[PDB]
């Protein structure tokens, strides 16, 4: 997997662009959507009541060891996550 099309480094940190597939057995990175420039993430939650947002952010805060917030897409499948205070190098190392 090449994650460089799904990330950009901003003033505040790194914006990781994902597309969520809900209702999964396990939350996990499964591939790259190159048409969207987004990481495909299976999410073990239903897509109701913010449960997929909660699971998604829990999984990524654990992975990066950084504050993760949804900056765009709270009610979309295509969510942009700001990982505050981190470089793109560090995020790519963690995604790999």
Name the site residues for Na ion (rule: CB under 5 A): 50, 52-53
Minimal distance, residue 50 CB to Na ion, in Å: 5
Partner from Cl ion, Na ion, none binding residue 82, C-beta < 5-8 Å depending on class: none
Minimal distance, residue 70 CB to Na ion, in Å: 10
Task: Give the footprint of Cl ion on this chain (CB under 5 A).
Answer: 10-11
Looking at the chain, list the stretches that DSSP marks H as alpha helix, in order from N- to C-terminal side. Answer: 51-64, 88-95
Could you tell me which residues are beta bridge partners of residue 38?
Answer: 33
* CA–CA dist 18, 29 (Å, integer): 9
Nearer to Cl ion (CB atom), residue 11 or residue 75: 11
Partner from Na ion, Cl ion, none binding residue 52, C-beta < 5-8 Å depending on class: Na ion
- Give the residue at shortest CB distance from Cl ion: 10
Minimal distance, residue 64 CB to Na ion, in Å: 20
CB within 8 A of 75, min separation 6: which ones? none
Residue of 28, 30, 79 whose CA lies nearest to 50 = 79
């Amino acid at each position: 997997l090449y994650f460089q099309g799904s990330l950009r480094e901003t003033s505040e940190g790194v914006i990781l662009s994902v597309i969520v597939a809900p209702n999964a057995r396990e939350t996990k990175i499964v591939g790259i959507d190159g048409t969207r420039g987004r990481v495909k993430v299976n999410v073990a939650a239903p897509p109701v009541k913010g449960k997929a947002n909660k699971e998604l952010m829990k999984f990524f805060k654990k992975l990066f060891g950084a504050e993760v917030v949804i900056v765009r897409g709270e009610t979309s499948r295509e969510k942009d996550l700001l990982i505050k205070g981190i470089t793109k190098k560090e995020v790519i190392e963690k995604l790999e």
